[PDB]
Enzyme design. Structure first.
Site, short mmCIF file in Angstrom:
data_model
loop_
_atom_site.label_atom_id
_atom_site.label_comp_id
_atom_site.label_asym_id
_atom_site.label_seq_id
_atom_site.Cartn_x
_atom_site.Cartn_y
_atom_site.Cartn_z
N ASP A 1 -48.32 32.50 65.85
CA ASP A 1 -48.82 31.15 65.93
C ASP A 1 -49.93 31.10 66.96
O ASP A 1 -49.70 31.43 68.13
CB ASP A 1 -47.70 30.18 66.29
N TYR B 1 -56.52 27.37 71.77
CA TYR B 1 -55.89 28.27 72.72
C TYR B 1 -56.83 29.35 73.24
O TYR B 1 -56.52 29.99 74.24
CB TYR B 1 -54.66 28.96 72.11
N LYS C 1 -54.81 26.42 63.86
CA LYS C 1 -54.85 24.97 63.76
C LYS C 1 -56.26 24.44 63.97
O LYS C 1 -57.11 25.09 64.60
CB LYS C 1 -53.90 24.33 64.79
N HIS D 1 -53.91 20.10 64.13
CA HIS D 1 -53.28 20.26 65.44
C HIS D 1 -52.78 18.94 65.99
O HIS D 1 -51.64 18.84 66.44
CB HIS D 1 -54.30 20.90 66.39
#
Ligand code: NAP
Length: 328
Positions: free
Chosen positions: A41, A46, A75, A108
């Protein structure tokens, strides 16, 4: 594994990458795939996708791991919650991952940010103001996600941090129904109501922060934010879970993950640590009694509850698509 409504299977244990800096996420993924992780994931926000790609490209080129054997989740950033920006960002995600497709693409956040830059995950104004897109239209945005599965850039598409009403609105309009919902979920925040709501619509729930988020308090204070009181509760220190851990000769973290998994709930524990990565995977071996489940059910704090709240700024709480005003 859990199988989406479109028939595709998703591993019930995946390795989370928030927050895994790229210096650490590459070795951590090497360790995870050695362990047996077949589900990663990540997210564009990120800033570790490129590193994951490097590690994946090594295992795909060299090692004995096929791409059809691994489940890649990324996402769409809140700065792309507009139908027009969707393929731009997934294309950007893919080239960092160096893949031709991801298995699962999520919205997201229901709450959009105005796109003030491609690499500008938190946009600000002439004043320090936080640039929020008041105009987030989900029906329109979701149709762009659907168009991404038709281009084959993603095999399935789903939602993250959405509530009932917004899931219901999307599914009733959906040409292709959400495959997966990813919300905060653990024994302190079991989301009984939202899971049963999604399971009624054959929507599978992946649980993030499944062993509570111990790093999060330090992260919320690192950002300009206030640490909620629900973040002051450690489900790995809870005596109930430790009592059940000794019964099975397992660790608290695996007890907490197991409780989610036996509800047919995917879980993505995040770990940099090569031992803790291995620890969270050794969880397919033991089954929890019908009685220890109900002690773990008693631990649930339901609403607040949330450590991953969405109330940092006024305009974010006041955004028309804020998910946590509704009960679930
Ligand atoms: N809005 C969203 O959609 C959203 C937001 C945030 C996160 N997520 C997803 O959730 C994943 C992260 O979940 P989380 O990290 O918030 O929740 P968590 O994984 O439950 O908390 C992980 C933390 O606990 C530690 N830890 C990991 N495994 C452990 C174990 N077996 N025993 C003891 N401590 C352990 C890690 O430290 P070390 O790193 O030192 O192991 C890390 O600091 C992210 O990768 C992302 O995919 C989604």
């Amino acid at each position: 594994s859990v199988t989406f409504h479109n028939g595709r299977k998703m591993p019930v244990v995946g390795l989370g990458t928030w927050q895994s800096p790229p210096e650490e996420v590459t070795a951590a993924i090497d360790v995870a795939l050695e362990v047996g992780y077949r589900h990663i994931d990540t997210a564009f926000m990120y800033q570790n996708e490129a590193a994951i790609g490097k590690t994946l490209k090594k295992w795909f080129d060299s090692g004995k791991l096929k791409r059809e054997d691994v489940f890649i989740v990324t996402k769409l950033p809140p700065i792309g919650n507009r139908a027009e920006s969707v393929e731009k960002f997934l294309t950007k995600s893919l080239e960092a991952l160096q893949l031709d497709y991801v298995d699962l693409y999520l919205i997201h956040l229901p709450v959009g940010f105005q796109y003030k830059g491609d690499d500008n995950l938190w946009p600000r104004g002439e004043a320090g103001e936080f640039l929020i897109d008041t105009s987030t239209d989900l029906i329109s945005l979701w149709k762009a996600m659907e168009a991404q599965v038709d281009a084959g850039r993603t095999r399935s598409v789903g939602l993250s941090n959405f509530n009932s009403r917004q899931i219901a609105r999307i599914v009733k309009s959906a040409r292709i129904r959400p495959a997966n919902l990813q919300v905060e979920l653990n024994v302190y925040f079991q989301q009984r109501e939202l899971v049963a709501f999604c399971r009624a619509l054959d929507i599978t729930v992946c649980a993030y922060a499944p062993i509570g988020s111990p790093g999060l308090a330090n992260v919320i204070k690192a950002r300009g934010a206030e640490v909620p009181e629900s973040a002051k509760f450690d489900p790995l220190t809870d005596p109930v879970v430790l009592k059940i851990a000794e019964h099975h000769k397992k660790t608290p973290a695996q007890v907490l993950l197991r409780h989610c998994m036996q509800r047919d709930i995917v879980v993505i524990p995040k770990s940099t640590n090569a031992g803790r990565i291995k620890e969270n995977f050794q969880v397919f071996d033991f089954e929890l009694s019908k009685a220890e489940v109900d002690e773990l059910d008693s631990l649930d704090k339901r609403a607040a509850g949330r450590r991953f709240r969405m109330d940092q700024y006024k305009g974010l709480r006041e955004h028309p698509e804020h998910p946590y005003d509704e009960p679930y």
